[PDB]
From a paper:
In , the iron storage protein bacterioferritin (Bfr) contributes to buffering cytosolic free iron concentrations by oxidizing Fe2+ and storing the resultant Fe3+ in its internal cavity, and by forming a complex with a cognate ferredoxin (Bfd) to reduce the stored Fe3+ and mobilize Fe2+ to the cytosol. Pa Bfd binds Pa Bfr at a site formed at the interface of each Pa BfrB subunit dimer such that the [2Fe–2S] cluster in Pa Bfd is placed ∼22 Å from the heme iron in the BfrB subunit dimer. The Pa Bfd binding site on each Pa BfrB subunit dimer is a shallow depression on the surface demarcated by residues L68, P69, N70, and Q72 from one subunit and L78, L79, G80, and E81 from the accompanying subunit, where Pa Bfd residues M1, Y2, and L5 bind. Small molecule derivatives of 4-aminoisoindoline-1,3-dione designed to bind Bfr (Pa Bfr) at the Bfd binding site accumulate in the cell, block the Pa Bfr–Bfd complex, inhibit iron mobilization from Pa Bfr, elicit an iron starvation response, are bacteriostatic to planktonic cells, and are bactericidal to biofilm-entrenched cells.
We conducted ligand soaking experiments directed at obtaining cocrystals of inhibitors bound to recombinant Pa Bfr. These experiments allowed us to obtain X-ray crystal structures of KM-5–25 and KM-5–35 binding to Pa Bfr. As has been observed in previous structures of similar analogues bound to Pa Bfr, , the 4-aminoisoindoline-1,3-dione (phthalimide) moiety binds at the Bfd binding site on Bfr with a conserved pose, establishing hydrogen bonds with the carbonyl O atom of P69 and the amide NH of L71. The linker and phenyl ring of both compounds interact with the cleft formed by the side chains of L68 and E81 in Bfr. The structure of KM-5–25 bound to Pa Bfr shows strong electron density consistent with KM-5–25 in several of the subunits, and although the phenyl ring exhibited conformational disorder in a few of the subunits, the subunits showing prominent electron density indicate that the Cl substituent of the phenyl ring is directed toward the floor of the cleft, while the hydroxyl group points toward the protein surface. The results obtained with KM-5–25 show that when the compound is present at the MIC, the rate of killing is slower than that observed with KM-5–35, and although the number of viable cells is reduced by approximately 3log10 relative to the inoculum in approximately 3 h, cell growth is observed at later hours. When KM-5–25 is present at 1.5 × MIC (limit of aqueous solubility), the compound is bactericidal, killing the cells at a rate similar to that observed with KM-5–35. The results indicate that KM-5–25 exhibits synergy with colistin (FIC = 0.36, 0.38) and is additive with imipenem (FIC = 0.63). As can be observed in Figure , treatment of the pellicles with KM-5–25 or KM-5–35 elicits concentration-dependent biofilm cell death.
Residue numbers in the entry:
A (entry chain E), B (entry chain K), C (entry chain F), D (entry chain I), E (entry chain C), F (entry chain G), ...: 1 to 156
Write the structure that this text describes.
Amino acid sequence: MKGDKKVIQHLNKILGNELIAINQYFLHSRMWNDWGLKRLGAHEYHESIDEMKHADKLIERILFLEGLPNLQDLGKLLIGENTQEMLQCDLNLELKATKDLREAIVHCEQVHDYVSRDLLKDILESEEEHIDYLETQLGLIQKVGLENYLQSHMHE
Amino acid sequence: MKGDKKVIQHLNKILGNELIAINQYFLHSRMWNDWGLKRLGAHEYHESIDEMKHADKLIERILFLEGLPNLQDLGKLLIGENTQEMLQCDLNLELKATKDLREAIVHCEQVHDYVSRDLLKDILESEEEHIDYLETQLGLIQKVGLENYLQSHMHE
Amino acid sequence: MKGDKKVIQHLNKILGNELIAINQYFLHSRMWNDWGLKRLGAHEYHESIDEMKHADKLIERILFLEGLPNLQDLGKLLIGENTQEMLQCDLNLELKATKDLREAIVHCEQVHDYVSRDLLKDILESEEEHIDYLETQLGLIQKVGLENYLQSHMHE
Amino acid sequence: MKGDKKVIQHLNKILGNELIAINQYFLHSRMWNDWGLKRLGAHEYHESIDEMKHADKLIERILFLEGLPNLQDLGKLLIGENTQEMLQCDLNLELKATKDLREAIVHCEQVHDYVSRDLLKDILESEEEHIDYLETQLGLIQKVGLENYLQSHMHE
Amino acid sequence: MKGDKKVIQHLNKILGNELIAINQYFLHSRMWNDWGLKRLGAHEYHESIDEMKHADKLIERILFLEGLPNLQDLGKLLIGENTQEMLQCDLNLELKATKDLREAIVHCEQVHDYVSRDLLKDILESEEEHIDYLETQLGLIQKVGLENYLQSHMHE
Amino acid sequence: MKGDKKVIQHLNKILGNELIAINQYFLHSRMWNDWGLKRLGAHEYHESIDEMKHADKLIERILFLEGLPNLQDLGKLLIGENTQEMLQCDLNLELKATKDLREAIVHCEQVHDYVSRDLLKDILESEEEHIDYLETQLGLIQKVGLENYLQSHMHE
Amino acid sequence: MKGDKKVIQHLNKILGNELIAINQYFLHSRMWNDWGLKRLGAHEYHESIDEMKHADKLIERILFLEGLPNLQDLGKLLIGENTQEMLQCDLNLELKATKDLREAIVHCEQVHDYVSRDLLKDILESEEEHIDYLETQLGLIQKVGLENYLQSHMHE
Ligand code: HEM
Ligand code: HEM
Ligand code: HEM
Ligand code: HEM
Ligand SMILES: O=C1NC(=O)c2c(NCc3cc(Cl)ccc3O)cccc21
Ligand SMILES: O=C1NC(=O)c2c(NCc3cc(Cl)ccc3O)cccc21
Ligand SMILES: O=C1NC(=O)c2c(NCc3cc(Cl)ccc3O)cccc21
Ligand SMILES: O=C1NC(=O)c2c(NCc3cc(Cl)ccc3O)cccc21
Ligand SMILES: O=C1NC(=O)c2c(NCc3cc(Cl)ccc3O)cccc21
Ligand SMILES: O=C1NC(=O)c2c(NCc3cc(Cl)ccc3O)cccc21
Ligand SMILES: [K+]
Ligand SMILES: [K+]
């Protein structure tokens, strides 16, 4: 079905954010696992998988709309050097991703691509859940102290 | 069954305390969950539910005694700004509630409303168990330190 | 995540309607049960529980958006004096509630808070189902007669 | 298998009656559900499904006989404004349909299409069962009164 | 609940499209079965059932909004004479239906009938799935050849 | 029970057709199996068994009517030497068989042998199902091409 | 455990190849699904998943050896425009990947990193299986023809 050209550009921009998130969260997961913080590693692993599922739905939507999904262009990963930095890097990416999602929804609404809007809204609901998780983790570090926070994330 | 006027006024006073407690505990619960202290959140939620069940029984007793349950007048919530304050606010409310239950029981005894007395005694038993819980939590904070106390209430 | 201030105000306004509805429907339920109209009493109980669940979600969303949920201010309960009036009081509350929901959705849309909109839409679907039910009950009173109508709501 | 042209025309006339009945019963069903007369709505829904099944078999037979089934021409629906009228409208359409079934059967027999006759007889048995149901409901309204009759059709 | 007059007119237009789709897909289904192309016949049968379910929901919504569902007016069916044309006919109807859905959604949004919008968005999602299926079938005919395409749809 | 003499002659004529059909379908089945077209072979085997079952019921009916079943006179088998011809031979036998069933039913009706008519009508329904199958197969050969058609009948 | 710097550089090159293959295979899978060639789409999906698991093991090994896994640099995807080209692009990438694996194993052996060698041998065994599959598909296209080959990959 011939999609709006600018909807497809937006969907490829969201997909681009997802490709970054996939790799950043996957690498953060494996860093946490290497460090023995397996509860963080498992949780971050699942965040990566959730982004992979989002990327799947975007690719499928783009192809249905007769566009070309862009899996070639990979933007800058934000990799922290300790747990607090890694969490803040994830949060910075999520905030950029939800900004882009909102702008994409605005355009989908204006050209009446209501199904593309519904897909982007569901992804945004997932991203706002991730934002809640990250903000909460960063606050927990302040409330229980870093050493306890990390201790609580050693074991699944 | 036409009840004693003052008994009903006592019952509506206790109900008023329950309405405060329901809302104060439900908000405390959701604050703790938002902060990632989910064990505190879950326990405080169950405390809110317990007060909801108490209020149901009081509403049911008032109506049987042919009074009008007061669900309109809501007293002042005591909302803390941190965990220790929230626990102490809960404790302050409970001590007021148990005072009011004792005075009402006295009056039920005097006019021989023994069933109302039994209901109130059952509620007083639950409220003393909550007081036990709250005093114990405040003591644990002193014994294990606030950061360890919070750490131990992150996960369920 | 720092929410829009007027979104938070709208959500607190929706929460305020829910707090009225919780108490109004609970009192109506317990009145219907006291009069032996247990089918009405049960259905109205479930309506109260539904509004409790909506309020929980609103409180959670407001806290996520870094606002203060208002559980202190209780508006005016509309309590009927017979079955027909009780149903009309519920319907009047519901119609005000759905007005406020739509205005809140407009504002969410305007500031691109699409997740808050989606939550309000879901609540709105639930409230329109309650209106359907209430309008239907009031029509049934006219079609079968009040005595038949009450007879049909004695037993669960 | 090349069928008799007038058999096919007769089958299309029966199909045409079924298309009317499908929509008339379905709308009557949803009206009754909207009014809270859910037992009438459920029964009328199953009448509508029964007519859909009859229409399927007719369409299949027509195509086997190398005719063109006519799903384009929709006759006048008879929609009531109250329960008694809706039942009488169904009954009126049923009497038209069974008259038409009888005439088609005569013709099938004359040209020795005994299989088409067998199908139409089965449909006729179903329609006479619907007539019994309809006549019985209209009789019950007189015997128990309209308000009791509707009361008895509120709940499934 | 009094609905917006133009929303109801839009809902009746969508319903009118569904009534065409129901009969057009059902006839196509039974033609394919008659020809021994049973996998197309089964798939098109389920398409027709899906439209029936959409029509039910539209009818229920129109009645709740105190409108009169229009099951009397039946537009032009598009019936192919071979498998390609039948698929192209379905696709032509679907493209008309989704245009009308988008216009109906616009009007629900403008009058704040967000629940009608949600229903229509769900139907639109289903229609775009059917469009994907249709476009894919027409593409496969080109990729595998007409004879193989039909061969692959003889058996379920 | 003494039957009408001409009914019994008609039943023996139908039995004679079945006896032809049993052997022709059984041999076509085993030819197809020998050729590796096992899906045709299996289906033709079941057509043969169906005819065996019809012949049983006719034999049983003739004996009840105190006639002598003729299992001695076997008419000409129509045996093809290729798939299309075998199917066309089956179709030609069926059309001759259904002609005879129609004339037999006419006579049973005339002399009021309504049970014999019902038996023959049931047999006629089965033969019209076989005619549908055969006509459909021949049509499929034209739509998908002979080589694909046979390919699709290699495997069960 | 401090690894050989050149081993890590090899591992990172292999990882680079995996990242290309993940995205190339995932896009090809979703293109095939969009074209209705679901058996190809599903098989290609499983190939993508396989490369994802390889990448995971390489990342984990690089971190164990105190290197930095490179998930930032994405080489050129080879995307076909039709099925034959897509398979040939997969095969060309695989032949590159296995050449790089052999040179990395040579180096692991020379510096006695026998565990890294064993991991790479296991990945090489998987890639040779994928090469077997791809060469076999391209041969099938020649043996059965493109139309039959594609037809055989429509359905799972
Ligand atoms: C375009 C980029 C990618 C896409 C679209 C993608 C997609 C997917 C999908 C759809 C799944 C299945 C999830 C499920 O159903 O539970 C999955 C699983 C997985 N992915 Fe990815 N992925 C991508 C990149 C990556 C990368 C770069 C890695 C590793 C660095 C990776 C590692 C994994 C793993 C380990 C699994 C689980 C496999 C299993 O079941 O054992 N993915 N991926
Ligand atoms: C008049 C004040 C209230 C009364 C009398 C009341 C009563 C009840 C009762 C009887 C239950 C069932 C508990 C059980 O037996 O499991 C319940 C459940 C619940 N209440 Fe309330 N309640 C009140 C206010 C509230 C408020 C203000 C909230 C939220 C702010 C709330 C949230 C809930 C929730 C989430 C549940 C659990 C529902 C479920 O089963 O999932 N309630 N309430
Ligand atoms: C030519 C007109 C129609 C035909 C031939 C037809 C045929 C059918 C058939 C064969 C079934 C399956 C029944 C079963 O065995 O369970 C069915 C189901 C149904 N039909 Fe129709 N139908 C028609 C029109 C309609 C219309 C106009 C509506 C709504 C206004 C409708 C609503 C339904 C529903 C709700 C179902 C049940 C689906 C489910 O199982 O969830 N149908 N129809
Ligand atoms: C007067 C002629 C025949 C009559 C009345 C007759 C009748 C029957 C009947 C009643 C059955 C049982 C059907 C069932 O399983 O439900 C049967 C089965 C069968 N018939 Fe015949 N049959 C006749 C001729 C033939 C011929 C000529 C052949 C082979 C050339 C044949 C081969 C078979 C086979 C293989 C079975 C399946 C038996 C089994 O495996 O249980 N029949 N027949
Ligand atoms: O990331 C990427 N997404 C893509 O679609 C893509 C490429 N497409 C090739 C192509 C295919 C078809 Cl079918 C039509 C026109 C085309 O140009 C090529 C390289 C990289 C990418
Ligand atoms: O919280 C509240 N409890 C109540 O009973 C109540 C109200 N009563 C109405 C009423 C009903 C009947 Cl049946 C008899 C006498 C009455 O006055 C009104 C507003 C708020 C409340
Ligand atoms: O209904 C009510 N909802 C509320 O949030 C509330 C109150 N908040 C206290 C508070 C806590 C924090 Cl952490 C930050 C700022 C604050 O003012 C106080 C009384 C009644 C209510
Ligand atoms: O209700 C309807 N039934 C139908 O058959 C029909 C139509 N037929 C098209 C057609 C197909 C073939 Cl294969 C042969 C000859 C034809 O004319 C067209 C519009 C509406 C209808
Ligand atoms: O397709 C149709 N949909 C309809 O509602 C309809 C009809 N309505 C009759 C009616 C009923 C009531 Cl209760 C109130 C006012 C009315 O005019 C009549 C014929 C055909 C149709
Ligand atoms: O793909 C990538 N893999 C990586 O390791 C990586 C980055 N690492 C940052 C870093 C972390 C630590 Cl803990 C120590 C030293 C460092 O420089 C940065 C950007 C992109 C990538
Ligand atoms: K009665
Ligand atoms: K083929």
